[PDB]
């Protein structure tokens, strides 16, 4: 199937701190595999999945020294943005970046990414053409014009089409699954009128999933209640969805679970 690499980077200023904190987290197929954190006693990129310890010392030294460079890049950029928005001293400020590549199931490049947010809102992104930039704010046009003038997008296009794909292939080989949800229905005597049925899905991976209750053939948002999918903490995720249905008409309500590891969706009813 398809594959991806992403690094999610954060630079954070707060009114007390001397200089910002820089954190870089790399993902392969949406699973964290390296992490740099300037707050560590000896800041360095570190493996976060056992299959990455295959990389020898000079990989880590090289990547660590790059991260110290990006840390200074973020420091200057945060200082510049402060002025672009006429923000005074004494606040908390955040720069965030996501970058990486998506690969088809043929392992060829689908799309490259390079996006930034300031204060948690879109600041500037490289367009899918990998040649032009989009920037919403009037303040961000200053950055776009700087980056257009220096031809910066050319280096980024080269990364996204070259090293990003090439190193993702290396990683895919060195770390060369899914867990289907287990579902059950719980019964919750609620009021005189009716009961709630709670359709649980447990132990699944990845987190993308969908639960639906149908009264004998009709999906309903009629006060169907759910929770956001949540990590169990062991690598797998959880979700439930609940609905109220008159007593004695329980097995007229039936829950469906959609997850990509399933041979087909699960249909299930309440079981005493």
């Amino acid at each position: 199937g398809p594959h991806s690499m992403r690094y999610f980077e954060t630079a954070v200023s707060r009114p007390g701190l001397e200089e910002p904190r820089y954190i870089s987290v790399g993902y392969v197929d949406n699973k964290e595999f390296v992490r740099f954190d300037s707050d560590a006693e000896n800041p360095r990129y570190e493996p976060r999945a056992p299959w990455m310890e295959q990389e020898g010392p000079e990989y880590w030294e090289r990547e660590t020294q790059k991260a110290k460079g990006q840390e200074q890049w973020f420091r200057v950029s945060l200082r510049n943005l402060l002025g672009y928005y006429n923000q005074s001293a004494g606040g908390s400020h955040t720069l965030q970046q996501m970058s990486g590549c998506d690969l088809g199931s043929d392992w060829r490049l689908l799309r490259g990414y390079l996006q930034f947010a300031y204060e948690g809102r879109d600041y500037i992104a490289l367009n899918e053409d990998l040649k032009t930039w989009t920037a919403a704010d009037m303040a961000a046009q200053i950055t776009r014009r700087k980056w257009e003038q220096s031809g910066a997008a050319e280096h980024y296009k080269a990364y996204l089409e070259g090293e990003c794909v090439e190193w993702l292939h290396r990683y895919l080989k060195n770390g060369n699954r899914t867990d289907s949800p287990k579902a059950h229905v719980t019964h919750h005597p609620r009021s005189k009128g009716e009961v709630t049925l709670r359709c649980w899905a447990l132990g699944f991976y990845p987190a993308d999933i969908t639960l639906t209750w149908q009264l004998n053939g009709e999906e309903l948002t009629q006060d169907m209640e759910l929770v956001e999918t949540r990590p169990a903490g062991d690598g797998t995720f959880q979700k439930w969805a609940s609905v109220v249905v008159p007593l004695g008409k329980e097995q007229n309500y039936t829950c469906r679970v959609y997850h990509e590891g399933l041979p087909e969706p699960l249909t299930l009813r309440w079981e005493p």
Partner: peptide, 9 residues
Amino acid sequence: MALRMTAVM
């Protein structure tokens, strides 16, 4: 391997 930004914002 992470992207290397060049020019500052």
